[model samples]
Target: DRAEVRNIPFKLGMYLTVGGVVNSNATRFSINVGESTDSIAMHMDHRFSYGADQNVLVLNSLVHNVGWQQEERSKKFPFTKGDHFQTTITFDTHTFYIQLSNGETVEFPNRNKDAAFNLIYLAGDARLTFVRLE
Candidate 1:
């Protein structure tokens, strides 16, 4: 239900790939990257039951305080319940880019504005097969 990877040496040109299966009855999940569990630079969320849309992909970031910047939402839900998925999240000098399993692309502001991150956190109903940074 929850997972955390700490002290990662993530830097520019490095890629973070998370592979997992989303439960059919799942409601929400989030993947966070930053310097620590308390400080997040990038947050990716999938909500299956919230707001006007049943399934929505949201992306944002946090530095010192919770940065509620503009949320980037996908037009379509790529993975359904029981669907296997993989996503690659990487960052450049300006922003973080997420490449979804369905080839859809999402972008978020790099609130930390740094080239390296040391933490990865995951929560909710995702059965992660693997989480890797290379």
Candidate 2:
């Protein structure tokens, strides 16, 4: 078993991508800074059971528990289980965008991208295929 992530160096205004799935069940993938105080998660939770809940994508900032959320409804064919979405974040510009299937995107912003974080901690049933930046 390899380490998920150890020494990460993501800067503000830098754009990057996080792709892959967590697990068969629900997953919690997050951008963790320091030990606590600052962090955000793009969680794909799948346990709503509201007749047919497709997939829940939520961006949660732990400092306030505020979430920028969206859901992919029941479709004929949807993204695969595990890792299937990409989060493109511009650290300097303070902009965020999600690249899912069908080449669709959802964008947002956060000033915390200025914070200096070295580790991008990920837990839960999730597995990131690759997180690359340019």
Candidate 3:
């Protein structure tokens, strides 16, 4: 399932907070923010319960017309099913710093090269408890 996050402030240095929980049987889940579905400025994909890339988080970008950039993965896995989690994503002009619930931060390059973005999408299984951008 996916939802559009309209009116989220997309300025440089903005912070987006996401709170959710992964069900016990969740196979795949992800959080994305960008200009649109075709232009994902940040894609945080966690494939643990299933999929070929289980136990990994893939970070990448989708630029419209330009296509996707290189994929990056987290060195440590901080997510697990049945765990409540909070993620804080801070955006810079050229980067995105994502802080996991365990206080670990992973930096990904802003391949989209834009700060003003409003589209956000979520897929797979998970219950979003809260979401806000400021």
Candidate 4:
């Protein structure tokens, strides 16, 4: 239910794309990018049926010793169970852009203030197929 890619030279203006298949009974899944497990610069949480959230995309960041930051909810919920998906992520100095498979783009602020990241963590109910950086 978890996978990770480490030592990635994920730099600003570079595109980091991930492809995966969501489980048929998935309730939620997350894609995190940052320095480590406890320090996430970009946290993308796709919730299908968790808590009071239904088919919502939540974005946030995590600081090591501190807790998660304020969450940002997206109006676009482009994912369905038992389907393949591709998500492309890129960041600039001030913002991070996520391009969903269904042709929708979401933006989140660059809260971590780092130019490069080295870790990519995937967790929850999905099978990761590929991860590419360019």
Candidate 5:
């Protein structure tokens, strides 16, 4: 399924916290922050067993005219299927920082580098419990 938060201002130093439960047999899920569905600043994909990726967190961005940029894979795999997870996200002009439920922080470059974003899109096999902005 999918969940979305739109028309909310997200700017530098602001935090977005998302809590969710991964599906029992989920293979993958994603959280995206952007101006719209097609213009993502940060795309975080968590894989339990998708294709050749197992327990991997892949990060990337979708530029307006350039499609997807290169992927940045996190070394830490703190997610598991059938479990509760939380992620807190904040960004600066140059990078996005995501803190996992297990307290591990992962960084992704701000490829789009916009001043602000108003959309948060969640997709794949997870159910959102709550989403908070501060």
Candidate 6:
């Protein structure tokens, strides 16, 4: 599968995080979706952050919310720090199977599915290569 950005660019599936630690603070991941700016993400616990779990954040274009298309029990995996990790996600198909590092299968039903913040960015003054599909 291929991933295009805003119908202007294209990118290759780099890697996948089949397993990782979600810090005690919250279930959030640093987003890097080929953007000019950088940002951090968090799955704010609905019970604590809000009254309902309506504040869903999905990163895949094929999905809207995890609750809507979940296949497994969602858990927290703290992200301490990393440089490059990726996945070629097809939201419409509800598939996140990609050739990523740490080599493992991450069978997620488009969790954290967001169309906007799905680019390639990093925090702490880091940089990632950007592209516009050929």
Q: How many backbone clashes does candidate 5 have?
A: 0
State the displacement of the C-alpha of residue 22, model 4, in Å, after optimal TM-score superposition. Answer: 0.4
Q: Considering every candidate listed, which one attains the maximal TM-score?
A: 4
Indicate whether candidate 2 or candidate 4 has the larger lDDT: 4
How would you encode candidate 3's per-residue C-alpha lDDT over 32-94 as one tens digit per residue? 888777878898888885556778888988778988789998766788898888999887778
Identify the leading candidate in terms of lDDT: 4
Model 4: lDDT equals 0.91
Native-structure RMSD, model 2: 5.5
Q: Which ten-residue region of model 3 has the weakest summed lDDT?
A: 1-10
List runs of model 2 lying over 4 Å from the truth: 1-6, 27-38, 41-54, 64-78, 82-87, 111-116
> Which should have the higher TM-score, number 1 or number 4?
4
lDDT of each: 0.81, 0.46, 0.81, 0.91, 0.90, 0.30
Question: 4 or 6, which is superior by lDDT?
Answer: 4
Q: Candidate 1 deviates by what RMSD?
A: 1.8
Q: What is the lDDT of residue 85 in candidate 6?
A: 35
Q: Which stretches of candidate 5 lie over 4 Å from their true place?
A: none
lDDT (10s digit) by residue, model 2, range 40-80: 43323333222344444444445445543443332322344
- The count of residue-pair clashes in candidate 2 stands at 11
lDDT of 4 by residue, 11-128 (tens): 9889998999999999999999998889999999999999999999999999999979999999799899999999999999799999999889999999756899999989898879
| Candidate 6 per-residue lDDT over residues 22-119, each given as its tens digit | 33434334333333332212111111122333223233222223222322323332223333433232222233443233343334433334333344
Q: What's the residue-level lDDT of 63 in candidate 6?
A: 28
Please provide TM-scores, in order, for all candidate models, with all chains considered together. Answer: 0.87, 0.55, 0.89, 0.96, 0.95, 0.30
Ranking by lDDT: 4, 5, 3, 1, 2, 6
Q: After superposing candidate 1 on the true structure, give the runs of residues whose Cα lies further than 4 Å from its correct spot.
A: 64-67
